[PDB]
Symmetry: D2
Subunit: 203 residues, 4 copies
């Protein structure tokens, strides 16, 4: 699937309809993807991953920092399947940050393994493209990419992940570990920043 498609004209939700940290009350325009909706979509994603990679060991690779929540929740849903079914995905985990791969184990530890890369968002797709080329050089058995969000943009290089949560309009989103200058990671909903939020936390 292209994932859950959010139209260009979608108005999102009034902030007053949800519980939102008071320190961000004036910094956000609307709620765009409620936390619980992300969870519902992530549950179905876990099952799709189980379908595609079930019955083989997986190395789950989290692209920090923005991927951390999606990673934890996706792995939690996969673990729920592992313990309530007879078929399993034994998993190990690693974490990288992109500058240039920062931290993480030797990429040679990926050689001959089934790798699931977990990302928060694909915009141009250039970054994931570059990451994939690099990882491929270490001869993994298989590599798939799960991304919570994919942006509809004319700047799109044309990269499509294997698993996508939501396909969104070309708007700058924050929340659910996605940040603006390190802020808004502590917000469980995906939201659009307000003009005052951009000005307040501007680098």
């Amino acid at each position: 699937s292209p994932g859950v498609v959010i139209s260009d004209d979608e108005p999102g939700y009034d902030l007053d309809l949800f519980c939102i940290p008071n320190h961000y009350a004036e910094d956000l325009e609307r709620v765009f993807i409620p936390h619980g909706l992300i969870m519902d979509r992530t549950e179905r994603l876990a099952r799709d991953v189980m379908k595609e990679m079930g019955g083989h060991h997986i190395v789950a690779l989290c692209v920090l920092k923005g991927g951390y929540k999606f990673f934890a929740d996706l792995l939690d849903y996969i673990k729920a399947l592992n313990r309530n079914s007879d078929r399993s995905i034994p998993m190990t985990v690693d974490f990288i940050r992109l500058k240039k791969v920062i931290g993480g184990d030797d990429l040679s530890t990926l050689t001959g393994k089934n790798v699931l890369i977990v990302e928060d968002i694909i915009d141009t797709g250039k970054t994931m493209q570059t990451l994939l080329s690099l990882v491929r050089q270490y001869n993994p058995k298989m590599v798939k990419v799960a991304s919570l969000l994919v942006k509809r943009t004319p700047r799109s290089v044309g990269y499509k992940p294997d698993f996508v949560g939501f396909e969104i309009p070309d708007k700058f989103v924050v929340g659910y570990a996605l940040d603006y200058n390190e802020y808004f990671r502590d917000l469980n909903h995906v939201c659009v920043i307000s003009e005052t939020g951009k000005a307040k936390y501007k680098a």
Copy 2:
């Protein structure tokens, strides 16, 4: 607020994008309100209830059968506030079914919890029965309120979602007792209406 307003032209979601029970695969048309969205909205409602009833004992009254999931979940979010704040709503619980002695409501603060209000006629009827026992105060929370010209004009104190006049199931709402065991609120398909018809 009127709650989360869902438009007449809301398309809903393709079933294929969510986890749904196999035995209903052919019987639903779209998912209308995702379980998680319901939880998010319910978390805010619990804070609204606390703001309005916060300093007092309440009797939480569940209207069975459809109100059972919303009731459990709303009370769970209230309890979360009760144990993480110095503000507290002590609660007792009661159940009733429409289609304990209400005397126990005399002089009490009562929160009635309902799955859905359509015409409002059922709730007005329930309210007139409760008021016969002279409660101290009565507030009503409904997960769903229908936008419909058939409404008698009754509006609840707390509303989750305001929806189009469409027949919905799931999250404990049924069609002939079926579809209660569905976490999402959904719109039933033609084959489902026929399969499960009385």
Copy 3:
């Protein structure tokens, strides 16, 4: 197999957990943490589906005490149903028990005929009540009848009835919380707990 809680189980200091402010002086110890109940319930759900998953299930909640266990147990069953190949519809009903045993507020028990009936209870103590309800239910020729009880007490007062599915086997001590009450109080408490002497006097009828 039930989790066995020993006679000498000391439980946990209240200050190690989050508990409702209005009950701070009213409880003695946390006996069974909420999280633990959830973990055990997850596994009970699976046991239930393994045994009953083969035919339409009617889940009967015994109010009021059964309501929390019922909701959570059904949530775990639903999670199973939506992440698996095969699935069966479940319908639900709710009943209260009253001595003249008399069943209040359910559907016609003829709805039970030919069905896999799952009765969901908070606690079995002497078990006289469940033993009576079962005899009743069996008049309507259910395909199958099984009982799930969050708690079962080790008590010399037992008539010898044991449920099919048990969360925890506990000592002969009065417990409250997770919808179990003392004079209607303590239902709004997530953990299973023991009441303090001040709690007993405050809420005594």
Copy 4:
């Protein structure tokens, strides 16, 4: 608080009482600390953290890899606290791996003037935290506190005691809830003890 004290002769739980990953059925001996108990304790820890640290911008530092589950859950509870009142403070997050060499984080200067919460899976000898602390303090945080899910009772202790402690456990080797044995057992919700067969099967 010393946290929830688990005795030397605590027997933990038979695996059959819980749902356990199919692939570890032979590799564990007992469940030691059920996932749910960890969550209940973590919720209370979150409240204690906000009570001490909630007055100023908090930077939460996750010590990878084993601290990742405790970190995600602890922060979720903290976020829940911050959205159910009108009083809250911003929190930012960082992730480090420990080699006195800190791998993969932001410049430590980003800690200057902040309330820093270091989140760890377990303290044993305590040598790692003490060394980490000695470094972090040289960046003049407004305050530095450490939350650790587990703290071991051991005569090998350097005498370090964290500020927030989930559980105080015996000197036993445990896995689960992101704690590993040679990278295995991270994908397990409960804290458990390995079996003899598990230890030989996954030995490095």
